[model samples]
Target chain A: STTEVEDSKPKLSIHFDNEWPKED
Target chain B: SKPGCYDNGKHYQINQQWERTYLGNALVCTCYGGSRGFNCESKPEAEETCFDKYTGNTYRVGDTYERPKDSMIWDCTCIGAGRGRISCTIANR
Candidate 1:
């Protein structure tokens, strides 16, 4: 097994718009 | 408690109806026959591209995704197929 790189960090993705178009 | 998701026996219940309005986390991967995403490549499934950063799309368990009736929020029902959880809500318009 290799080292941990302190288990990495930093990630953020929040896409709640998949495309966008719908309203009537 | 307070340590939800990635149980392997599989069960995810994010927000459930707590009204934080998506885009922070609402992941539902009850990988029964298998599927999960966005993380935990420690697979019981979830490797069909592993994407669900709030419904950018990648779901399993009947898979019912939606967004917009005026920018909808939750309740993207994927309840029951292998493991189970997801009766989401928080789109009050």
Candidate 2:
């Protein structure tokens, strides 16, 4: 049986800070 | 308008506010507020949010994000209007 390895990668909370600009 | 930055026989006129050389990578130039010295790269001092065109995501100044897949951290900073600088570094490295 193979053992599962724990993920050690960091997590990020990404979000938009402003509204998207309108196309010209 | 006078010549600002000339490269390969193409003259980038002076006093042209917000004019950028979009043709080729040769002699990249940008003008701001009709200032002199066409080759001068002047950016606005205002602090604006950064817009990531690739991901359609916006980030405020001083915001940091760490990529889970690559363990890379991206720090956002406002450089000019609708423009910013994203510094990437390895997380916990």
Candidate 3:
């Protein structure tokens, strides 16, 4: 019920799809 | 196992496709219908709207969301309705 956003977590795509483009 | 999507959508995250095989996660959802956004509020697929994140525009299915030919953009929310798991959620709304 709360946001667990990590500030220093590097914002990595844990379950990312390599084919998908990054928001640059 | 004839794995399939449910009428209301599948509940489990079976066969982990996060690092799916099709170069992109879409390659999985494309055939399995898991590529679309998950909006718990949408009642019908026809009433849904997909955003062309690259062009910053909204377009429905069966409609060509044309961006510039030379534009370097791609749809953020991979979506395809009338299929297996083409759904949406309220988290990103």
Candidate 4:
């Protein structure tokens, strides 16, 4: 007998970071 | 309009914004170009392979590779794919 396997969904996430203003 | 998350050649539109901490010295940011999150920092949700940092090679799920470290040979297999975490496991040698 042969065994079968299924592929899983990908892992994803959103990240947030601070963007500082540039000094003149 | 709500922001969307782009990953794995697909765009995922979200109905709500996720809460995040704001920096006192910086201005608040928003997503752009079909990206989600306050800073537009989004990563692909689906990964089909595992990357080897040392060798700079990618291995698909269920693929095996041998890494000779010191004296013992480590047999590693790539597990997990698509919208799942990509991880590697060391098989018994």
Candidate 5:
């Protein structure tokens, strides 16, 4: 039961280099 | 964890992506706290809620989604959910 979760805003902007294909 | 997050210990209601394994009466709804604060891009009508792991059934109010890559995504339309929500994907709460 602590605090500080903040899951975002860490300098924002994230791109996995335009990926695709997930039908494995 | 709006309308969710329980600490008084009512079998532990941890809605809004707190992720679950087992918290009495059976529960598995996991919510990685979508997009933080009021959730969903910082409060887009923030009404996210879920809880239905083997009959714990707790998806209150009208639901919605869209946290895409930032995480938190597992939701089944309640009603005695089986291997459909969370543990079925990396989702929901």
Candidate 6:
């Protein structure tokens, strides 16, 4: 039988800070 | 970039702080579109639905189904699920 869950972490996305640095 | 607003193909971007609530194993993407894996690449649908990856269940608004031995029947009602997002709420069985 297969596991109830896929046995993987939840699909989550996190961003620490804004302000995208750019290069010239 | 920002937390809110993403393509279905791109994973949900969490900004500064805070998060969303979960209703059991239902992974309801909050207000967005995507292709796969926490992203919203597709456009919003007039009607949204939820599919249980684990049990191979398909759910729509105002629908109810029970999981195996979970002692819980999900009230798969729409919680403002639109615009490329599918959401649901839990109710008493």
Query: Which model scores highest in TM-score?
Result: 4
Q: Cα lDDT for residue A21, model 5? A: 25
Residue B70 lDDT in candidate 6: 43
Alpha-carbon DockQ of candidate 3? 0.02
Sequence-dependent TM-score of model 3: 0.24
* Of 3 and 4, the candidate ranking higher by lDDT: 4
Q: Which prediction has more favorable DockQ, 3 or 4?
A: 4
lDDT per residue as tens, model 5, B1-93: 244333222222333432222222122233322232121121122333454433545554343232322254433232212121222223444
Listed for each candidate, the true contacts retained, as a fraction, are 0.00, 0.00, 0.00, 0.30, 0.00, 0.00
Per-residue lDDT of B63 in model 3: 50
> For residues B1-93, could you state the per-residue lDDT of candidate 3 as single tens digits?
234322232333433332122222222221232444222211222444444444566665445432332223221332444421212212322
Question: How far off is residue B72 in model 3, in Å?
Answer: 6.7
Per residue, candidate 1 scores C-alpha lDDT tens digits across B1-93 of 233332333334642211122333334323221122223211122322223345566565556554443254444444432333444444443
Residue-level lDDT of model 2, residues A1-24, one tens digit each, is: 121223211222221122223356
The lDDT of each candidate is 0.33, 0.36, 0.30, 0.41, 0.28, 0.36
**TM-scores of the models, in the order given:** 0.17, 0.31, 0.24, 0.38, 0.16, 0.28
Error of 1 at B44 (Å): 18
Question: Which candidate do you rate higher for lDDT, 1 or 3?
Answer: 1
Error of 5 at B11 (Å): 46
- What pairs collide in candidate 5? B17-B31, B17-B32, B30-B92, B50-B93, B73-B91, B73-B92, B74-B91, B74-B92
Q: What is the per-residue lDDT of model 2 for residues B1-93, given as tens digits with 9 covering 90 to 100? A: 332434222344443434232232122344321333334332333455544543567777556554333344333232232344554443443
- Point out the higher-scoring one by lDDT: 1 or 4: 4
TM-score for chain B of each model, two decimals:
0.19, 0.35, 0.28, 0.41, 0.17, 0.31
lDDT of 5 at B36: 23
Better candidate number, 5 or 6, judged by TM-score: 6
- lDDT rank, highest first? 4, 6, 2, 1, 3, 5
Residue B56 accuracy (lDDT) in model 6: 70
After superposing candidate 5 on the true structure, give the runs of residues whose Cα lies further than 4 Å from its correct spot.
A1-14, A19-24, B1-45, B61-93
